[PDB]
mmCIF file of C-alpha atoms and ligand atoms in Angstrom:
data_model
loop_
_atom_site.group_PDB
_atom_site.id
_atom_site.type_symbol
_atom_site.label_atom_id
_atom_site.label_comp_id
_atom_site.label_asym_id
_atom_site.label_seq_id
_atom_site.Cartn_x
_atom_site.Cartn_y
_atom_site.Cartn_z
ATOM 1 C CA UNK A 21 -10.395 28.795 -12.260
ATOM 2 C CA UNK A 22 -10.525 25.862 -9.837
ATOM 3 C CA UNK A 23 -9.906 25.782 -6.111
ATOM 4 C CA UNK A 24 -7.175 23.532 -4.742
ATOM 5 C CA UNK A 25 -6.657 21.590 -1.533
ATOM 6 C CA UNK A 26 -3.230 21.196 0.095
ATOM 7 C CA UNK A 27 -1.606 17.755 0.356
ATOM 8 C CA UNK A 28 1.876 16.528 1.261
ATOM 9 C CA UNK A 29 4.079 13.743 -0.027
ATOM 10 C CA UNK A 30 7.320 12.646 1.657
ATOM 11 C CA UNK A 31 10.033 10.472 0.102
ATOM 12 C CA UNK A 32 12.625 8.975 2.458
ATOM 13 C CA UNK A 33 15.449 8.822 -0.101
ATOM 14 C CA UNK A 34 18.767 7.341 1.042
ATOM 15 C CA UNK A 35 21.895 6.865 -1.147
ATOM 16 C CA UNK A 36 20.898 3.406 -2.431
ATOM 17 C CA UNK A 37 17.241 2.939 -1.455
ATOM 18 C CA UNK A 38 13.908 4.693 -1.026
ATOM 19 C CA UNK A 39 11.147 3.990 1.478
ATOM 20 C CA UNK A 40 7.706 3.590 -0.056
ATOM 21 C CA UNK A 41 4.415 2.524 1.477
ATOM 22 C CA UNK A 42 1.769 0.280 0.011
ATOM 23 C CA UNK A 43 -1.463 2.240 0.332
ATOM 24 C CA UNK A 44 -3.853 -0.137 2.085
ATOM 25 C CA UNK A 45 -7.101 1.832 1.657
ATOM 26 C CA UNK A 46 -8.448 5.122 0.390
ATOM 27 C CA UNK A 47 -7.042 7.239 -2.410
ATOM 28 C CA UNK A 48 -4.485 5.448 -4.545
ATOM 29 C CA UNK A 49 -4.969 2.186 -2.658
ATOM 30 C CA UNK A 50 -2.873 -0.610 -4.134
ATOM 31 C CA UNK A 51 -0.006 1.643 -5.243
ATOM 32 C CA UNK A 52 3.378 2.179 -3.643
ATOM 33 C CA UNK A 53 3.807 5.815 -2.699
ATOM 34 C CA UNK A 54 5.514 8.274 -0.435
ATOM 35 C CA UNK A 55 3.804 9.196 2.827
ATOM 36 C CA UNK A 56 1.424 12.120 3.156
ATOM 37 C CA UNK A 57 -2.082 13.462 3.323
ATOM 38 C CA UNK A 58 -4.154 16.593 3.750
ATOM 39 C CA UNK A 59 -2.581 19.621 5.395
ATOM 40 C CA UNK A 60 -4.599 20.610 8.463
ATOM 41 C CA UNK A 61 -5.507 24.107 9.603
ATOM 42 C CA UNK A 62 -2.785 26.000 11.444
ATOM 43 C CA UNK A 63 0.191 23.774 10.628
ATOM 44 C CA UNK A 64 2.749 24.736 8.029
ATOM 45 C CA UNK A 65 2.940 22.545 4.951
ATOM 46 C CA UNK A 66 6.315 21.188 6.102
ATOM 47 C CA UNK A 67 4.962 20.390 9.556
ATOM 48 C CA UNK A 68 1.953 18.674 7.998
ATOM 49 C CA UNK A 69 4.355 16.568 5.953
ATOM 50 C CA UNK A 70 6.333 15.645 9.076
ATOM 51 C CA UNK A 71 3.093 14.746 10.869
ATOM 52 C CA UNK A 72 1.807 12.491 8.077
ATOM 53 C CA UNK A 73 5.192 10.773 7.798
ATOM 54 C CA UNK A 74 5.018 9.923 11.496
ATOM 55 C CA UNK A 75 1.385 8.797 11.358
ATOM 56 C CA UNK A 76 1.794 6.598 8.282
ATOM 57 C CA UNK A 77 5.340 5.221 8.677
ATOM 58 C CA UNK A 78 6.248 5.737 12.340
ATOM 59 C CA UNK A 79 9.316 7.789 11.393
ATOM 60 C CA UNK A 80 10.069 11.067 13.165
ATOM 61 C CA UNK A 81 12.346 13.546 11.387
ATOM 62 C CA UNK A 82 13.596 16.948 12.486
ATOM 63 C CA UNK A 83 13.443 18.531 9.038
ATOM 64 C CA UNK A 84 12.377 17.975 5.457
ATOM 65 C CA UNK A 85 13.488 19.693 2.280
ATOM 66 C CA UNK A 86 11.140 20.781 -0.492
ATOM 67 C CA UNK A 87 11.764 19.034 -3.801
ATOM 68 C CA UNK A 88 8.665 19.675 -5.905
ATOM 69 C CA UNK A 89 5.031 20.585 -6.325
ATOM 70 C CA UNK A 90 2.517 18.624 -8.394
ATOM 71 C CA UNK A 91 -1.049 19.707 -9.129
ATOM 72 C CA UNK A 92 -3.531 16.922 -9.917
ATOM 73 C CA UNK A 93 -6.843 17.388 -11.701
ATOM 74 C CA UNK A 94 -9.406 14.598 -12.103
ATOM 75 C CA UNK A 95 -12.217 14.514 -14.649
ATOM 76 C CA UNK A 96 -15.466 15.081 -12.782
ATOM 77 C CA UNK A 97 -13.799 16.622 -9.694
ATOM 78 C CA UNK A 98 -13.876 20.441 -9.376
ATOM 79 C CA UNK A 99 -11.134 20.542 -6.746
ATOM 80 C CA UNK A 100 -7.436 20.299 -7.635
ATOM 81 C CA UNK A 101 -4.956 18.453 -5.430
ATOM 82 C CA UNK A 102 -1.960 20.705 -4.723
ATOM 83 C CA UNK A 103 0.698 18.197 -3.604
ATOM 84 C CA UNK A 104 3.866 19.543 -1.981
ATOM 85 C CA UNK A 105 6.668 16.984 -2.252
ATOM 86 C CA UNK A 106 9.463 16.725 0.320
ATOM 87 C CA UNK A 107 12.518 14.555 0.849
ATOM 88 C CA UNK A 108 14.914 13.634 3.576
ATOM 89 C CA UNK A 109 17.822 11.220 3.825
ATOM 90 C CA UNK A 110 18.110 11.550 7.620
ATOM 91 C CA UNK A 111 15.975 9.268 9.800
ATOM 92 C CA UNK A 112 16.513 7.803 13.243
ATOM 93 C CA UNK A 113 14.048 4.946 13.767
ATOM 94 C CA UNK A 114 12.421 2.003 11.935
ATOM 95 C CA UNK A 115 9.353 2.113 9.686
ATOM 96 C CA UNK A 116 6.208 0.481 11.026
ATOM 97 C CA UNK A 117 2.990 -0.534 9.311
ATOM 98 C CA UNK A 118 0.004 1.748 9.932
ATOM 99 C CA UNK A 119 -3.646 1.364 8.970
ATOM 100 C CA UNK A 120 -2.951 3.452 5.860
ATOM 101 C CA UNK A 121 0.467 2.226 4.717
ATOM 102 C CA UNK A 122 2.768 -0.797 4.724
ATOM 103 C CA UNK A 123 6.309 0.602 4.415
ATOM 104 C CA UNK A 124 8.924 -1.203 2.366
ATOM 105 C CA UNK A 125 12.428 -0.298 1.215
ATOM 106 C CA UNK A 126 13.252 -0.436 -2.506
ATOM 107 C CA UNK A 127 16.700 -0.382 -4.059
ATOM 108 C CA UNK A 128 17.126 2.503 -6.501
ATOM 109 C CA UNK A 129 17.434 0.094 -9.447
ATOM 110 C CA UNK A 130 14.098 -1.521 -8.470
ATOM 111 C CA UNK A 131 11.737 1.440 -8.243
ATOM 112 C CA UNK A 132 8.294 -0.179 -8.620
ATOM 113 C CA UNK A 133 6.961 2.162 -11.301
ATOM 114 C CA UNK A 134 4.357 -0.286 -12.646
ATOM 115 C CA UNK A 135 2.757 -0.336 -9.170
ATOM 116 C CA UNK A 136 2.943 3.447 -8.616
ATOM 117 C CA UNK A 137 0.753 6.273 -9.873
ATOM 118 C CA UNK A 138 1.436 6.659 -13.630
ATOM 119 C CA UNK A 139 2.689 10.220 -13.249
ATOM 120 C CA UNK A 140 5.504 9.109 -10.928
ATOM 121 C CA UNK A 141 7.358 7.762 -13.973
ATOM 122 C CA UNK A 142 7.818 11.372 -15.152
ATOM 123 C CA UNK A 143 8.759 13.230 -11.960
ATOM 124 C CA UNK A 144 10.407 10.574 -9.769
ATOM 125 C CA UNK A 145 13.545 10.505 -11.969
ATOM 126 C CA UNK A 146 13.959 14.247 -11.327
ATOM 127 C CA UNK A 147 13.730 13.630 -7.587
ATOM 128 C CA UNK A 148 16.461 10.987 -7.901
ATOM 129 C CA UNK A 149 18.716 13.456 -9.754
ATOM 130 C CA UNK A 150 18.137 15.984 -6.926
ATOM 131 C CA UNK A 151 16.370 18.356 -9.326
ATOM 132 C CA UNK A 152 13.433 20.490 -8.229
ATOM 133 C CA UNK A 153 10.249 20.374 -10.261
ATOM 134 C CA UNK A 154 6.739 21.667 -10.849
ATOM 135 C CA UNK A 155 4.210 19.324 -12.421
ATOM 136 C CA UNK A 156 0.554 19.183 -13.403
ATOM 137 C CA UNK A 157 -1.373 16.035 -14.382
ATOM 138 C CA UNK A 158 -4.989 15.649 -15.507
ATOM 139 C CA UNK A 159 -6.370 12.144 -14.969
ATOM 140 C CA UNK A 160 -9.408 10.310 -16.241
ATOM 141 C CA UNK A 161 -9.979 7.955 -13.353
ATOM 142 C CA UNK A 162 -6.939 6.379 -11.740
ATOM 143 C CA UNK A 163 -4.971 5.177 -14.754
ATOM 144 C CA UNK A 164 -5.205 7.548 -17.721
ATOM 145 C CA UNK A 165 -3.356 10.848 -18.136
ATOM 146 C CA UNK A 166 -5.131 13.223 -20.568
ATOM 147 C CA UNK A 167 -2.754 16.187 -20.235
ATOM 148 C CA UNK A 168 0.335 17.021 -18.240
ATOM 149 C CA UNK A 169 3.149 19.508 -17.762
ATOM 150 C CA UNK A 170 6.508 18.926 -16.075
ATOM 151 C CA UNK A 171 9.277 21.473 -15.646
ATOM 152 C CA UNK A 172 12.529 21.695 -13.763
ATOM 153 C CA UNK A 173 12.695 24.805 -11.576
ATOM 154 C CA UNK A 174 15.424 26.382 -9.504
ATOM 155 C CA UNK A 175 13.118 26.988 -6.513
ATOM 156 C CA UNK A 176 9.970 25.067 -5.584
HETATM 157 N N1 8OG B 209 3.109 9.748 -6.078
HETATM 158 C C1 8OG B 209 1.869 10.256 -6.193
HETATM 159 N N2 8OG B 209 1.213 10.643 -5.081
HETATM 160 C C2 8OG B 209 -0.033 11.140 -5.211
HETATM 161 C C3 8OG B 209 -0.632 11.264 -6.465
HETATM 162 N N3 8OG B 209 -1.875 11.802 -6.288
HETATM 163 C C4 8OG B 209 -1.954 11.954 -4.951
HETATM 164 O O1 8OG B 209 -2.978 12.461 -4.358
HETATM 165 N N4 8OG B 209 -0.862 11.608 -4.295
HETATM 166 C C5 8OG B 209 -0.566 11.580 -2.846
HETATM 167 C C6 8OG B 209 -0.732 12.897 -2.105
HETATM 168 C C7 8OG B 209 -1.035 12.379 -0.715
HETATM 169 O O2 8OG B 209 0.192 11.938 -0.118
HETATM 170 C C8 8OG B 209 -1.883 11.144 -0.972
HETATM 171 C C9 8OG B 209 -3.387 11.410 -1.005
HETATM 172 O O3 8OG B 209 -3.886 11.807 0.276
HETATM 173 P P1 8OG B 209 -4.447 10.684 1.278
HETATM 174 O O4 8OG B 209 -3.190 9.999 1.764
HETATM 175 O O5 8OG B 209 -5.153 11.474 2.354
HETATM 176 O O6 8OG B 209 -5.369 9.818 0.460
HETATM 177 O O7 8OG B 209 -1.504 10.672 -2.264
HETATM 178 C C10 8OG B 209 0.106 10.850 -7.573
HETATM 179 O O8 8OG B 209 -0.361 10.914 -8.725
HETATM 180 N N5 8OG B 209 1.330 10.371 -7.409
HETATM 181 MN MN1 MN B 210 -2.531 10.104 6.456
HETATM 182 MN MN1 MN B 211 -2.220 9.488 3.505
HETATM 183 MN MN1 MN B 212 -4.374 13.253 7.468
#
């Protein structure tokens, strides 16, 4: 039995493109990713996801929808990362670079998998098919998956 810490991840997914951010520092630096971070005390998970989206990309959205949950375990770390993944297609402003992230749009036939976390190759296709998922990935370091589970679910 391990304890887990709550994190969010937000994908701005439009009909032909997705917004990703190049992580400029910290965890997963150097990889394109959705926007997110630790959930803070008192806020709902969804509101924490909205907050991190605004902080990291400048975008303000009224609502998100839950699309998945991924649990990450790292060799040598007792604490699991419980990542709650959200989408929206509805935005109303322009992305702006923050200290954490440089946003960039990618066409949906140019998803930059080689420059994303390795696990994204497994679950991101489900997100694109509008399927809900639960995943678990155990990493050695940043690059090597030792064990994983991925399942489509009807509710997140
Ligand atoms: N796409 C993707 N995102 C991840 C993985 N692991 C991981 O912590 N994240 C996200 C969750 C959070 O949005 C962010 C980590 O929190 P910070 O932004 O506070 O460093 O990275 C992963 O393997 N793939
Ligand atoms: Mn953040
Ligand atoms: Mn972050
Ligand atoms: Mn934060």
